[PDB]
Amino acid sequence: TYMNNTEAICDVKGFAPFSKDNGIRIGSRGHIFVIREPFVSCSPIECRTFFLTQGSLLNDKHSNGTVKDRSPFRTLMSVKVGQSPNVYQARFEAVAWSATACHDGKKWMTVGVTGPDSKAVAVIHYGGVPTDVINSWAGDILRTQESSCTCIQGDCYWVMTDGPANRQAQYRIYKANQGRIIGQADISFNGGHIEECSCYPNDGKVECVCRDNWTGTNRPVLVISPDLSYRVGYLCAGIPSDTPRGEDAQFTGSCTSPMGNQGYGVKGFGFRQGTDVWMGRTISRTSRSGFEILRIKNGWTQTSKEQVRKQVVVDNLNWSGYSGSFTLPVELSGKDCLVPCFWVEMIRGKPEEKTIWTSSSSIVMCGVDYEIADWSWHDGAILPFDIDK
Amino acid sequence: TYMNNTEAICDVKGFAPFSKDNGIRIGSRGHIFVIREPFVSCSPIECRTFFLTQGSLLNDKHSNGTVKDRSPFRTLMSVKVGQSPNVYQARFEAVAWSATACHDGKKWMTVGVTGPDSKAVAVIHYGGVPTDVINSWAGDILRTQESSCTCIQGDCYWVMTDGPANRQAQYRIYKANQGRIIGQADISFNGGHIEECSCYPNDGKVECVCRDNWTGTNRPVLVISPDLSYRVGYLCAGIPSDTPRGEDAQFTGSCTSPMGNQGYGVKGFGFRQGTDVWMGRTISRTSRSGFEILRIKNGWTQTSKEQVRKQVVVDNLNWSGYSGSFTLPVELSGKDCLVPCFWVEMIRGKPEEKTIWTSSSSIVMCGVDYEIADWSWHDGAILPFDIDK
Amino acid sequence: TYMNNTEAICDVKGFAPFSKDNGIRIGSRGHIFVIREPFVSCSPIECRTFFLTQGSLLNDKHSNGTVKDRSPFRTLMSVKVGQSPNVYQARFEAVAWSATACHDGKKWMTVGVTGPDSKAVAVIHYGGVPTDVINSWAGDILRTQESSCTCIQGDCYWVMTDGPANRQAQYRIYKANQGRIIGQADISFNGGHIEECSCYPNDGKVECVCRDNWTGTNRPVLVISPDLSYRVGYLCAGIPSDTPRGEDAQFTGSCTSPMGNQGYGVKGFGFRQGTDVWMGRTISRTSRSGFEILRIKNGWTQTSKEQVRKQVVVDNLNWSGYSGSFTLPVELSGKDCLVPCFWVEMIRGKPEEKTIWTSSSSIVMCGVDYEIADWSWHDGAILPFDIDK
Amino acid sequence: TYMNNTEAICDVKGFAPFSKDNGIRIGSRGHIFVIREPFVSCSPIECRTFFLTQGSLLNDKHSNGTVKDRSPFRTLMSVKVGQSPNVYQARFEAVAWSATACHDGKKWMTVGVTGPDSKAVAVIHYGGVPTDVINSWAGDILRTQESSCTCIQGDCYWVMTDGPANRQAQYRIYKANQGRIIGQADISFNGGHIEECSCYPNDGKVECVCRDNWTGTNRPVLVISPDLSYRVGYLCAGIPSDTPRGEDAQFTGSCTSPMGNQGYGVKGFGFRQGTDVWMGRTISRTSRSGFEILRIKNGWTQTSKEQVRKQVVVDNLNWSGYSGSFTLPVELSGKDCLVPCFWVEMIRGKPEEKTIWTSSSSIVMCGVDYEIADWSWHDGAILPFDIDK
Ligand SMILES: CCC(CC)O[C@@H]1CC(C(=O)O)=C[C@H](NC(=N)N)[C@H]1NC(C)=O
Ligand SMILES: CCC(CC)O[C@@H]1CC(C(=O)O)=C[C@H](NC(=N)N)[C@H]1NC(C)=O
Ligand SMILES: CCC(CC)O[C@@H]1CC(C(=O)O)=C[C@H](NC(=N)N)[C@H]1NC(C)=O
Ligand SMILES: CCC(CC)O[C@@H]1CC(C(=O)O)=C[C@H](NC(=N)N)[C@H]1NC(C)=O
Ligand SMILES: [Ca+2]
Ligand SMILES: [Ca+2]
Ligand SMILES: [Ca+2]
Ligand SMILES: [Ca+2]
Secondary structure, eight states, X not given: OOOOOOXXXXXXXXXXXXXXXXXXXXXXXXXXXXXXXXXXXXXXXXEEEEEEEEEEETTSGGGTTTTOSOOTTOEEEEEETTSOOBSTTOEEEEXXXXXXXXXXXXXXXXXXEESOGGGOEEEEEESSSEEEXXXXXXXXXXXXXXXXXXXXXXXXXXXXXXXXXXXXXEEEEEEEETTEEEEEEEOOOTTOOOEEEXXXXXXXXXXXXXXXXXXXXXXXXXXXXXXXXXXXXXXXSSSOOSSXXXXXXXXXXXXXXXXXXXXXXXXXXXXXXXXXXXXXXXXXXXXXXXXXXXXXTTTTTSOOOOEEEEEXXXXXXXXXXXXXXXXXXXXXXXXXXXXXXXXXXXXXXXXXXXXXXXXXXXXXXXXXXXXXXXXXXXXXXXXXOSTTO | OOXXXXXXXXXXXXXXXXXXXXXXXXXXXXXXXXXXXXXXXXXXXXXXXXEEEXXXXXXXXXXXXXXXXXXXXXXXXXXXXXXXXXXXXXXXXXXXXXXXXXXXXXXXXXXXXXXXXXXXXXXXXXXXXXXXEEEOSSSSXXXXXXXXXXXXXXXXXXXXXXXXXXXXXEEEEEEEETTEEEEEEEOOOTTOOOEEEEEEESSSSEEXXXXXXXXXXXXXXXXXXXXXXXXXXXXXXXXXXXXXXXXXSSOXXXXXXXXXXXXOOOOOOEEEETTEEEEEEOXXXXXXXXXEEEEEXXXXXXXXXXXXXXXXXXXXXXXXXXXXXXXXXHXXXXXXXXXXXXXXXXXXETTTSSSSOEEEEEEEEEEESSOOOOOOOOOOOOSSOSTTO | OOOOOOSOBOOOSEEXXXXXXXXXXXXXXXXXXXXXXXXXXXXXXXXXXXXXXXXXXXXXXXXXXXXXXXOTTOEEEEEETTSOOBSTTOEEEEEOSEEEEEEOSSSEEEEEEESOGGGOEEEEXXXXXXXXXEEOSSSSOOEEOSSXXXXXXXXXXXXXXXXXXXXXXXXXXXXXXXXXXXXXXXOOOTTXXXXXXXXXXXXXXXXXXXXXXXXXXXXXXXXXXXXXXXXXXXXXXSSOOSSSOOOSSSOOOOSSSOOBSOOOOOOOOEEEETTEEEEEEXXXXXXXXXXXXXXXXXXXXXXXXXXXXXXXXXXXXXXXXXXXXXXXXXXXXXXXXXXXXXXXXXXXXXXTSSSSOEEEEEEEXXXXXXXXXXXXXXXXXXXXXXXXX | OOOOOOSOBXXXXXXXXXXXXXXXXXXXXXXXXXXXXXXXXXXXXXXXXXXXXXXXXXXXXXXXXXXXXXXXXXXXXXXXXXXOOBSTXXXXXXXXXXXXXXXXXXXXXXXXXXXXXXXXXXXXXXXXXXXXXXXXXXXXXXXXXXXXXXXXXXXXXXXXXXXXXXXXXXXXXXXXXXXXXXXXXXXXXXXXXXXXXXXXXXXXXEEEEEEOOSSBSSOEEEEEOTTSOEEEEEOOSSSOOXXXXXXXXXXXXXXXXXXXXXXXXXXXXXXXXXXXXXXXXXXSSSSSEEEEEEEETTTTTSOOOOEEEEEEEEEEEEEOOOEEEEEEOHHHHOOXXXXXEEEEEEEEETTTSSSSOEEEEEEEEEEESSOOOOOOOOOXXXXXXXXXX
16 A cells, blocks of 8 residues: 555645754764755654765764765765664665655655766665666766655656756656656756755645756746656746845746846755745855745745745754755644645854864754744754864 | 543552663763653553753763753653663654653654743644644743643643743643644633643543642642543642742641742642542752652642651652653553552752753652652762763 | 463583673773673563663773672663663663563563662562562562573562571562562571572473572572472582582582582572583682583482583683573474573673772573583673773 | 575676665774674565674774684674664674574574684574584584575575685585574585685575685685585686786686685675676785676686676775675565675775774675666775774
């Protein structure tokens, strides 16, 4: 029996905290992995926290130069949601410096991309055993969501990318069944750019809000049917949710094209709620600091910038970073819909801080039927560490 | 099938030790969380120790200022009863600086109150996944039992509080089913004050002995039916079981009103045994040191101060603190009644001791059919630690 | 369905190693409990290593004075056989400075004796939840096997002791069912002395080889029927298996009375093999060093000193100490008999060595159908530790 | 129901990474065992990493002289594939300084050889409980595969060795059922030498590529039927896959006899793919550095040196060492054949490096239907450690 995941995304008014691991504060004395790009995904029985290790530990010399993105030592592991990425509760998942993982109702599927930049291999694991393989088709840093992939009625959908990080690249959709690749598709997006999508299920379709690392300060949107016909564009809303981005005033908005002129970016998410959208963004406009989520009326389909709800999760005095989407299985929450949840990565260390290392901890939040008071569930580590001294 | 928990509380003559974790002594070298407010609760298969972490570890710099009550880093976690609140056996439960948790026969329900003082949110988890939410109704430190909530025939009952910690506040009863809030009630207690109740089941009803942080050195009592009609008052017995409290002589006793004149307090418990009561208190009258339990004949219904049984668990040379109630499931003990058990928190560090940190360890005791010799299962940590030096 | 344990003890020719935990060597850097009196017991699914913690860890200051026998901090915990008594794989069992534990086919029963010397309480746990209680009947250090208790057809049999450690004391037999005490018996042994028995099943009866801490250098033997009628005596064999003991020549032997004249002792074991006996002893005659096991033809029923088999397990350059018996469930080994197994405790530290601490590690051995070459599976820790310096 | 393992070995074009534990890098701060000879084996539910501990930990003084091969403290333990050989996730397996382990569909069988050189005992464990025993038949370091043994239709086959490490020795085949030895055989190989075979299933037969520590730089091959009739020889291919070995040009090749003239060696593997062979070897010809795998057309049956595929896994600037074979159960991968997988041991420390210790980490790779880009999933530890200083 599969976890069908066919329902509609609930309409939520606000977000309550799910979890907070204190990974970095604990790692000051604890045996915690140095890691980046954590994310959450759930099965009918548990929600887990996936992460990319730097094959080393906080407060140790091997944490030096952990600002580096890709390395032979980086592995995908997992723990229970809320737990710290410690050694002693960690499940090995895949060798990976870019990843995605998700459950199909019967078993975990995980994809781990590793290898050399010009010829990376993506190892598909299902049930903790390699089953398939995707080679780099364009020869330039084959990568993936860095968040939950999406499983609907037994098939699992995710988005990859190959090509420049600064100009046109190439993006595809992959679909597997019990670890086996049964489908793929090229996305036609000229003038567009899609990195590190954050996807979820919604009316039996894969909705994804991605990252434009080329020119858009608006987020590319993508809605994938099971037959791998797609709808690609930008988040209509007249509010920019990438970082770096311009003010909210000097911004227009487009359903179709990238707007903004600044390049760069950060991974992020958004949930549709009919015509509206809960969109995620850092508080700072130019730095990875602070985190809030906004509800834009009609923002999914219009260039609207009408805010009816807003909630701060990390204050702008505290570092954040990545954020992504996932959903609670109907088998878990009991609802008749899919409870939208998100996580925020909270980067500490280099390049912003006084360390030889870079790492991050996380907070997870879940959609509820009420408005939630603003606050800051901040990281709370005191830098530098002993290793930095 | 639910864990019905409908029986009568056994009549016990004394208490034998269940467990002792040595959390602080182990934390001198081990990787143990800095924590406060631990408590125990059981399922048909295990008893667990819940606790509030300070998002950091003993002997580490992040343990500084751990005397603080509320923080963004405080989380509810759990281990097996008797185990130390270590990192490597810990289950993440909820983000919380005030909490309660209990099992319904099918799954753990946990409530974790966190957020800002003036608008705290209580996240209801059931089965390790947020399901409901209670916002602060009175805008002043929404809080809860800091001990086991109570489940009877599938519904789970607990008591919250919002308002001043020094004068009249507001208290409610909440009732949920599989994580969903299906009921609540306002408690009318003018001139009264209810903090951190310690509840248990007894003839299909929730019996609670609470804390008066306003003026009573006697403990408010509360007996909750499943329909959320209640009976609120004070522990009749002519003996005061709060701290600070006066002598046993210069005290009268009331079934109805607060007596004593000193304010302040500490969380504590009591079990009814017909008309009598096993009541819990620190040995010192003005400090959180020592621990004994007393059996007052007719003490539940009279202002009696007749002691038939007495048992010292912590001597008055050693620190203690909180104490609370729980019960063994009939599915566990095999009895035809509910075995009354309690735990004592043993606070070490600030404000009483020579540290930058505050933490605590625990001992658990269970009702048996015999008298048990007095002794001191004391904490045993040697302060200050390396971090303090 | 129960684990009937009704078979005969196999006849084995030699012993192969089961396990070795390296607990102390690992504890030089690892987070290992300071412990004493470890022992093994098995269920139809696993064999576990029980031990008494000193509520502290190796290489830590709280390990000071760990030579002390009884303390409020000493707890019974357990791990998998062969694992180290580490914090992070440990199951809490009971508060105990003297203990026994055993499985009935359905659940673990454990007994943990703690409290004050003159009024100790023994807390009976079954399935990790206190169920019964035995108070000190003679008021002088109520204690027990310090090794596996014995379960036959659902009932569990063990031996306790109360009274002097140097003269006549009092010893009883206890029998429980699912944690409940259903029987007990006084053992009439005037001029005799029984400490820390090492028992096993054999033709549906409990065979025990104990310790005489009064005057015998021979080991008291005891064979318990399920109705609690017993046969008490001494190990007939003309060879002394206690420490301190005299030479093998200047010794006679008795089936009935204590021989030897030296007092003191150490816990030890023996298996019957028809009329013969595998008997366990240290190599040294006056110190707790070295370990070998001997097969005495007709030694169970005669004062024989005829050795047909012999096997050294610890050489006399290396420390040992306690040793005890247990059996593999027929459900585990597959045999049509009960495979005799033993463990040796290897004490390190005080009083023999240059430390502030005392601890021990273990080796487990199991009866096989062949002779096994002599060797020394010694402890291997390098003393003193960092803490000692 | 058994795991029949009767299928054919898949024909694979290349190898994708399964796992990488970073055991040594983590052990710079983590609590990781000092170990050697790790290997992988799988059940219908998980793949585990077996290893031989040195009964001590990295960065600790007890890691001194860990270059030693055999010791009383060396034990076989296991973790999940990809996990680090840490203390806190380790399963005790057997006391062993030479080992093999494998699953029969119902339970793990493990063999652990320990004891004195001249009379070693091999303890057979099945289901984590000793069941059988093999004594040294030739009196000179009884040893075994140091990799997965092989189970076909409920019976488990493996190869042992007794005798000189430099000249003729003696080798046997053992076959067991649920831990019980039901068969054995002498291998007639005069002028030959077989150490540390690496075996796998293939058409219901045990195929093994071994190590010649006498004179061959080619690897002895062995194909074992269930009736214990065998076919013994050398890997036909005209390419030498041992280390030390000569150039590929000044080498001939033999299906039958040892070629090469240099002695010494290292454990290694090979898979048949019809008439071809995937053969494993270090990159260096004289040192244990680098690792690649080659596909020789017709290499299994001819003295061919025709390479159609090649893949570098460890570069020749980085240390490697042992490598061995295993297979994914059909119950795991879903294929209609047995997916060939291998692991490479990556030795660090003595004799090559600036330490008092020797240890190693690992990488696991699995056969896929495509060519995989060359790279170096190297160890990555920075030597010397703190302990070395
Ligand atoms: C534009 C996003 C991708 C494209 C190469 O780069 C990721 C950017 C990034 C960041 O902090 O902004 C972190 C990621 N690092 C890892 N996944 N290890 C970058 N991704 C990769 C694959 O290098
Ligand atoms: C009067 C009891 C409550 C009311 C605010 O305060 C708790 C007092 C307390 C103590 O040691 O006395 C500890 C609690 N700390 C935490 N739960 N973190 C106080 N409770 C809160 C919610 O701050
Ligand atoms: C004569 C055996 C008993 C009788 C009091 O003493 C035990 C002796 C002992 C030893 O090393 O010889 C260790 C035990 N320590 C603990 N069990 N903690 C002694 N037993 C007790 C209960 O103190
Ligand atoms: C020739 C292979 C065997 C024969 C005695 O020796 C093993 C060589 C070896 C190495 O690094 O080359 C390591 C092994 N060590 C352990 N298994 N502990 C050697 N094997 C034994 C049993 O000593
Ligand atoms: Ca951008
Ligand atoms: Ca008060
Ligand atoms: Ca004696
Ligand atoms: Ca060779």
